Symmetry: C5
């Protein structure tokens, strides 16, 4: 086989067409899976197939018939091939069981297909200010390590038709949508200009799960604190334990939510809602302290419902409704 290719007779340390125009190299990608995601480290992991296409007259071979020849990674060391790398990647590797998952297919005309299977972890900067109502966009980037656009020209072989994605692709914690491709020119002052390829996608959460587990309990506890305004002010051993036990219950709820969340140490939209609800419950405990004190002062001086309860029955609900209208107009 390797005697028909004239491997011993050519310098394969240099590209096709050296000293002349650039070599055009086309690319396809097939995404096999999304493997995990980390919100505190801000990265994601992906497994894919990567395919390259070009022509080299040094590899043309005589044949009576149109049959191609096929080789593995042991030929790759002896000929020239393109030099792609993944930009902004944290780590990656090429699969090797039961042997190296790499292939070369060569036509009698000297056209080449070069194919490999690979796993990569890449960074994706995330903003959690609107959590849990946030939306994140991420991308994977491809570039030549050593050749500027004067020597190698890199492009998507079929436009957006160059990207395929597995029919069963999913994540346990997110909804994935809107896969599409783009390109852009980039500059490095030590070397010059390069073309870069992009794969783009969007992530979203299951909203009703978070509403049920977080917003609904806090709202129910605020409503229980209002029941106190309808209990007789003479029942001190009933009015006093109800308040402080409601404060304890709101406190344990907020502690459990904090223990369950990812460790992102800045203020988020759900934080604001919980601490405002805590303040409403605290203020209901100050209301009865005022009522009891003034009742006692009148009983002492002088020796039906009090006006403060009458007003609280109206004012506490109205204020909480106003808060909710503003909050949901901000976070939509």
């Amino acid at each position: 086989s390797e005697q028909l290719l004239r491997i011993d007779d050519h310098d394969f340390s240099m590209r096709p067409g050296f000293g002349g125009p650039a070599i055009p190299v086309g690319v396809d990608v097939q995404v096999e899976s999304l493997d995990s995601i980390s919100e505190v480290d801000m990265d994601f992991t992906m497994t894919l197939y990567l395919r390259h296409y070009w022509k080299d007259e040094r590899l043309s071979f005589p044949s009576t018939n149109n049959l191609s020849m096929t080789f593995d990674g042991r030929l790759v060391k002896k000929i020239w091939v393109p030099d792609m790398f993944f930009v902004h990647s944290k780590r990656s590797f090429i699969h090797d069981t039961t042997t190296d998952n790499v292939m070369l297919r060569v036509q009698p005309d000297g056209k080449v297909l070069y194919s490999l299977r690979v796993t990569v972890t890449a960074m994706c900067n995330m903003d959690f200010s609107r959590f849990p109502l946030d939306t994140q966009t991420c991308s994977l980037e491809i570039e030549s390590y050593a050749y500027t656009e004067d020597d190698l020209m890199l492009y998507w072989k079929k436009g957006n038709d160059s990207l395929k994605t597995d029919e069963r692709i999913s994540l346990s914690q997110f909804l994935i949508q809107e896969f599409h491709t783009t390109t852009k020119l980039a500059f490095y002052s030590s070397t010059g200009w390069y073309n870069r390829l992009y794969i783009n996608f969007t992530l979203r959460r299951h909203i009703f799960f978070f509403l049920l587990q977080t917003y609904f309990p806090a709202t129910l506890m605020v409503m229980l604190s209002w029941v106190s305004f309808w209990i007789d002010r003479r029942a001190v051993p009933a009015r006093v334990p109800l308040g402080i036990t409601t404060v304890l219950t709101m406190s344990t709820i907020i502690t459990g939510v904090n223990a369950s969340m990812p460790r992102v140490s800045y203020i988020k939209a759900v934080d604001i809602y919980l601490w405002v609800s805590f303040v409403f419950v605290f203020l209901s405990v100050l209301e009865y302290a005022a009522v009891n004190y003034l009742t006692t002062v009148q009983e002492r001086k002088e020796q039906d419902t009090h006006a403060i309860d009458k007003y609280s029955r109206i004012i506490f609900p109205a204020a909480y409704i106003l808060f909710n209208l503003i909050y949901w107009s901000i976070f939509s």
Copy 2:
């Protein structure tokens, strides 16, 4: 040894029978263990033996007697062998202590057995909507990396008798059952058609553990909230603390369950049961607020059991029974 095989005289970069019909290659598998499983990453890990069978006249050798010859991984580099890989795998490796766990056995006729020991991690997409009453099915897949069915024909050597599983195979968190084999043809537009082999199995949970730890406590707390309807309405400092302390107790139970569960952020069958029980307890606290208010209004106007308690003693249990009948007809 390696001079009887005519290694220096043949091109082992190409398959047996090249330019003619396909080479048939048979396969056996012996599963040694299931090593771990991840529900948030959606994958499982397995260790196994993989065995391959074929014939190659280039490896036939003269002998007076029927003795075979046996070799290790140092021959594999010099001859031709099949090119299997594990489809949809996240990572894998071949064992190498005290040396490479690889073997080749060759008959005087040129029949070959090729054997190796390997560990693989593979993806298995899971749905947790019915948790803890869910059932999961998983599979492992085997294919040639470079040869279509025009050049290599891949098959199970003995039918379903080709698969063996270790007598002590188990998992700490699941029951495993129904190991069996299948095959299917697959298509890639850049190359053509391939045959693929499958190993299939099913996973189930220990149901009574989850009933005892999750459903039983919530049911007991709902029943304690009903005790209030049988206590004298005049005892305000008894009726009021009982309710709010029952709400606190249900809240700490739900927080502990949430902290213990895998981090799958969508709504599950057990979530529904817990939040409905929370609402039943909240409504029992509103019932006495009504009774106490109306009692106070009559005492003020005018200066035995109340009808609301009489009805609640009947209506709250009946409604919870109706809920349970519907719920268990849905989740079965």
Copy 3:
């Protein structure tokens, strides 16, 4: 050195005595440490020295005197050596700092000692039904990868004297005892019969730690629930808060134990004890609801201690004693 051994003149791809009887190979082991253990993955990790002994006339060398020659891993590649592997192992490796921890010692007669230092992780199936009163037994297994008993005969060189264990060997969470060796013949239908070597040991827990942290608190809370039967039935605002706060306290205890335990999702001996104690406390809350209701009915009809308290003072302790006697006769 390597010119006295006639390395260039012999085929070291095949065993001593090929075409004749089997080569006997003796083995010693010295355990250096037990490194970790996992209860949810069901495996353990160990570091050891492994030593092999045999004779090969191809390695005999002329000498005036009884001095042996000593070599490192660079000779191992050029001669024949045995092919041992660890059965049912998850992963393993051979140490290489400051160089490969491998040695060969050769006598003028052609006797060889082959020695290496290695770390291995191996599976050990565990049953936790009796936890914390469980006992586990584990073993490590050694075998030839390619040679049946017709070609290689594997044995412990000195009987049980072949195994040594480090004087400071320990685990943070277990007591280790009863190290001993065994052997057994095993069969594979594709190849034939093999002899296998075993190292065996036993694991146990610190019982009084678990009694103090788990059984003692639950027993104290059951006894506090009984104090209620000695408090005046007229004190409704005292009898009612005591019960529901005891239920809350038992609930937080059980939640903490569940959060601390390994994630084995089936029912264990300690689970049974905790949920029976929870039911005893719940039933003490139903007792006073009956007493208060019937007292109120008589006061209404008609307009000293009640018999139900008198009987409960005797019956609740007797029943709990009976439960404990049965339980400890079952789990011993």
Copy 4:
């Protein structure tokens, strides 16, 4: 290509200019990302590009025109290159997908550019005494492993213009600022003097997040404990449960904060604030015990507000204000 360079004719085991003055080697760095940080292990991880510049007459080549030649890691093994390493690093690696991310560019004059992409984890000693108001400074260090300043002279090629940082660089838990470069001479008694290069940066936290989650709840609970001084001393079943339930609520808050914090086992500024607030709440429970006892003694002897309440209404708030003024003058 490699025949124009006279690789076979020169000893590339030794530096340019050996037996004469030192070889000057210039350096640039481009930071691609900060990848993670650990507060308990005291280290950080970074990915970067590293570039080296020097001249070697042995690599000058004849040409009619000013075109450079470009090579990969397969030339690096055959010529001389500098020997940089990262001082005080825990681990590091050079990227290799789809091939080694290493490049050599050579001019006809014999000037060389040597470039590679690398990930490193480095130690950064941290002090948490002022947490959460702490500020940390970290640095990365570069040096030659084998050559003193008598043989190799190492320097930043353009001053502070030699360092570039990615426009999207960020961390989930910190604010990063003030990237700048320095150099310093270092001494080893076994070999001599070396020049070392430094990259320096500063880290800070989001202060208002920690104020909201930690300081605000403790302050609200101290204020609720003061409400008791305004409730009638005759209401024993109201005054007594309020105190002990406030103590319980402060206790659960402190436990949640401790469970959420990194495991640094020495006293921190936020610890001091929480335990002082706990003591204020405890002392409010002792105040009413005194009032109730003395009231009972007078009622017994003899058979309006008490002076202790009157004074507590003034003294407890004044003392807590004084504490806050001192504390915030210390931690600023």
Copy 5:
């Protein structure tokens, strides 16, 4: 360079002075960092420089002047070097970025310096019975893998001056002190006697952090339980809720401490203190049950402070003081 050394003319598979006396080899160590520590696995991780010194006449070279020659890891494969390994180590590796961090310096006389940078993880058996007042001692050990003292003699080159430690060495959770060196002879029955080198150090904790977080809260809760003896026995709805809420508060404290501690499943000094404090609080709840029962019996028979309170006011504090004196005389 490598032609002045007569590499092709000498057998570097054997030591200097073979068939004669032993080769003396001297050693220095420079500790760069302590990298982490694990209390449940019982090990620690360290990074260091290791340096070796010896003489070999086969490496003497002619020179007019006193200049040494310097080489990297590519010479190490061709000559003889010592064979050190780290005894009782779990894992280790040698650094390789931007190339292998290994160096050889050779004098014209044939004296050699051999130097490398390395990271190692080593076991250190720990006892936690006195926690948090425990003290731990650890050591790292160095030995030849293949040569007994008849062939190689290993020693510290300068006594205790052979060990240096970095001026900024620290751990987040411990105080480190008392670094010093020792040596000892060791015996293996299969080979003979070897000399071993030791590096020794000591670890201690920050005591006042643990006192503040663990012992102080439990002591305050015991003192609050005593307040009950000073409240009027007629106030049943005050005396009864105070006790059971104090029991709940002690229970949540102990649960939080247990959740925060390393998972060492045997009894520790701090365990004893917490469960004794729990028993004191339980006994204060039994005291009032007795007082209330006997008061009720006298009121029934017959139809000021009770003696049991009078005695409890003295006896409970005295007993707790006695316990503390004994406990701190035991744990010091």
